[PDB]
Amino acid sequence: RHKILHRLLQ
Amino acid sequence: RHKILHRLLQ
Amino acid sequence: HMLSDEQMQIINSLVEAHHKTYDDSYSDFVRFRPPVRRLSMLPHLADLVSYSIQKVIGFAKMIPGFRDLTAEDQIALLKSSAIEIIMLRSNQSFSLEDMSWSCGGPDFKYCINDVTKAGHTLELLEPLVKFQVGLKKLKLHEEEHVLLMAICLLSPDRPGVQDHVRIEALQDRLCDVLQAYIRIQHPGGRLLYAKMIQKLADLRSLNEEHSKQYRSLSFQPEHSMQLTPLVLEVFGSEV
Amino acid sequence: HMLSDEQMQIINSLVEAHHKTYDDSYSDFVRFRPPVRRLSMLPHLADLVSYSIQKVIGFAKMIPGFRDLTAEDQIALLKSSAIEIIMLRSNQSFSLEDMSWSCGGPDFKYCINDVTKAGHTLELLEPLVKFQVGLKKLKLHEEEHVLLMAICLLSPDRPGVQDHVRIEALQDRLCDVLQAYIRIQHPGGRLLYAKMIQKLADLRSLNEEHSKQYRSLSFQPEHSMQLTPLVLEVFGSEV
Numbered sequence: 001r002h003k004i005l006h007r008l009l010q
Numbered sequence: 011r012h013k014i015l016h017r018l019l020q
Numbered sequence: 021h022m023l024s025d026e027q028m029q030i031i032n033s034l035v036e037a038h039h040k041t042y043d044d045s046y047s048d049f050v051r052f053r054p055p056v057r058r059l060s061m062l063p064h065l066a067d068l069v070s071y072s073i074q075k076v077i078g079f080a081k082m083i084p085g086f087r088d089l090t091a092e093d094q095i096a097l098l099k100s101s102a103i104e105i106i107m108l109r110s111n112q113s114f115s116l117e118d119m120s121w122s123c124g125g126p127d128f129k130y131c132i133n134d135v136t137k138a139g140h141t142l143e144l145l146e147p148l149v150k151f152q153v154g155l156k157k158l159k160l161h162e163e164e165h166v167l168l169m170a171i172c173l174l175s176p177d178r179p180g181v182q183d184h185v186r187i188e189a190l191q192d193r194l195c196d197v198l199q200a201y202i203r204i205q206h207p208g209g210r211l212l213y214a215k216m217i218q219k220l221a222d223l224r225s226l227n228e229e230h231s232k233q234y235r236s237l238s239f240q241p242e243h244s245m246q247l248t249p250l251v252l253e254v255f256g257s258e259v
Numbered sequence: 260h261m262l263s264d265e266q267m268q269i270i271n272s273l274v275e276a277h278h279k280t281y282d283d284s285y286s287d288f289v290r291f292r293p294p295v296r297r298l299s300m301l302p303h304l305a306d307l308v309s310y311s312i313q314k315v316i317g318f319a320k321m322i323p324g325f326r327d328l329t330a331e332d333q334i335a336l337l338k339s340s341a342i343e344i345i346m347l348r349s350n351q352s353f354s355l356e357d358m359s360w361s362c363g364g365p366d367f368k369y370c371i372n373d374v375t376k377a378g379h380t381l382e383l384l385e386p387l388v389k390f391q392v393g394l395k396k397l398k399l400h401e402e403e404h405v406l407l408m409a410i411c412l413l414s415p416d417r418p419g420v421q422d423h424v425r426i427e428a429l430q431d432r433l434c435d436v437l438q439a440y441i442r443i444q445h446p447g448g449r450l451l452y453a454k455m456i457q458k459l460a461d462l463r464s465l466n467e468e469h470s471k472q473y474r475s476l477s478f479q480p481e482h483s484m485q486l487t488p489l490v491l492e493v494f495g496s497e498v
């Protein structure tokens with residue numbers, strides 16, 4: 001879950 | 011799953 | 021030779037459904053995210069396809085016999101054929117003069133280089149433009165063009181279908197309407213039916229190459245976040 | 260009385276981070292879906308908040324001590340405080356003359372009636388505009404405004420936090436910088452710190468009322484499809 005948030009956090 | 015498709019199919 | 025009353029009513033329902041789900045002026049295009057000339061054209065094209073998916077579903081619900089299917093077969097047929105139906109209706113805006121889709125001024129004129137600004141390599145764009153030229157040369161009537169989309173949509177060889185016996189029954193009944201219409205109302209179309217069936221197998225290769233490049237994008241979240249919830253659902257692998 | 264070298268460097272890092280993640284000209288607003296005057300303003304506002312979430316994450320990554328936290332605490336802190344941080348930075352565009360957010364001409368001027376065209380009742384809009392007026396009256400300095408957002412973001416009382424002992428350690432160290440800055444560089448601010456802490460509890464009520472109206476939308480797919488994948492992820496209940 002939260003695949004975009006992990007990526008947006010570099 | 012496919013919550014939007016079910017709704018778009020009326 | 022001529023058609024029956026029930027076969028012509030299928031034609032009256034498909035042509036009306038296409039007119040109700042297609043705008044020859046492309047006025048709703050201003051409501052999308054603006055086109056930008058990494059992956060600058062992705063937001064605009066993602067809204068363009070998501071808007072098209074909504075219209076394909078509206079056209080599917082008015083196909084005679086499609087609404088009596090189970091809700092699961094309607095999803096399996098729509099998901100696996102969405103990009104193919106979109107490529108069919110996109111020919112209505114394609115022009116052989118500039119070899120690009122023309123929907124407005126310089127903003128809504130999607131050249132081959134514009135789709136490259138969405139992450140697509142020439143491995144898919146080269147056969148796609150080749151498909152639009154071969155389809156545009158057929159000069160299909162409005163009845164033939166709307167029949168090809170209904171036949172492409174009711175294909176039994178879709179991954180996920182369950183009652184594929186009725187699906188083939190509806191597709192072959194749709195094929196007989198097209199095969200007879202060309203014999204009656206289309207002069208010089210003694211070989212047209214085989215050319216249209218050939219275009220269906222070409223869409224399968226375009227569908228396969230499209231799914232490989234989309235799959236590569238879907239794993240990168242910084243790009244898939246620019247998509248729409250409907251595109252992620254139709255082009256997704258969930259079941 | 261005065262501040263230390265390490266406390267002023269926290270100020271130099273927060274103000275620089277806010278300048279790097281906020282545009283006083285609002286030029287990127289043209290890249291959103293256009294505003295329309297059922298739920299006509301929903302696409303434009305959904306892109307407006309999704310764009311703001313990306314900037315809040317950029318501002319969070321430059322808060323000293325936030326990057327050393329676990330990736331799970333960074334998500335739990337961002338998800339539960341995203342709408343609060345957005346309401347804080349939105350005051351930079353709010354104007355007491357027209358009682359609305361001014362970001363451009365008549366298109367980017369979000370009145371109270373415009374947010375109603377997104378599905379929001381006056382049960383949330385009435386305290387929200389009341390919050391913007393009370394915050395605008397404080398005339399917070401740029402150092403105080405950026406400190407309030409960092410304190411609101413590093414709140415330990417967020418559902419989902421794990422190592423809330425270090426989170427409270429970072430927030431109280433951020434509170435001491437604000438409590439001292441007002442005593443030194445802000446004349447007439449003998450009661451300002453208590454007013455800013457009071458605004459944090461007001462954001463909790465705005466956060467609660469916002470989550471109730473969003474939850475009612477999220478269950479209706481014909482409306483949630485107009486959202487963005489980032490908004491659905493931050494405002495979602497997945498964990």
Ligand SMILES: C=C1/C(=C\C=C2/CCC[C@]3(C)[C@@H]([C@H](C)/C=C/[C@@H](O)C4(/C=C\C(=O)OCC)CC4)CC[C@@H]23)C[C@@H](O)C[C@@H]1O
Pocket residue numbers: 065066067068069070072106107109110111112113114121123130135138139140230233234235237251
């Ligand atoms: C769809 C219609 C129209 C044009 C369609 C076009 C022309 C431009 C290119 C289009 C959009 C084609 C492109 C290549 C396909 C795109 C999708 O996969 C998409 C983009 C990117 C993506 O998935 O990237 C993954 C790497 C997710 C949104 C489809 C039809 C083509 C215009 C009108 O005739 C209406 C009609 O209704």
Ligand SMILES: C=C1/C(=C\C=C2/CCC[C@]3(C)[C@@H]([C@H](C)/C=C/[C@@H](O)C4(/C=C\C(=O)OCC)CC4)CC[C@@H]23)C[C@@H](O)C[C@@H]1O
Pocket residue numbers: 304305306307308309311345346348349350351352353360362369374377378379469472473474476490
């Ligand atoms: C966010 C910023 C700005 C303005 C913010 C505003 C003004 C208009 C109203 C806004 C957007 C507020 C509204 C009410 C909140 C909306 C979200 O929940 C949202 C909308 C709808 C939704 O969830 O409907 C569920 C029923 C999903 C997108 C937030 C900040 C407010 C403008 C600049 O200062 C930049 C800053 O960065």
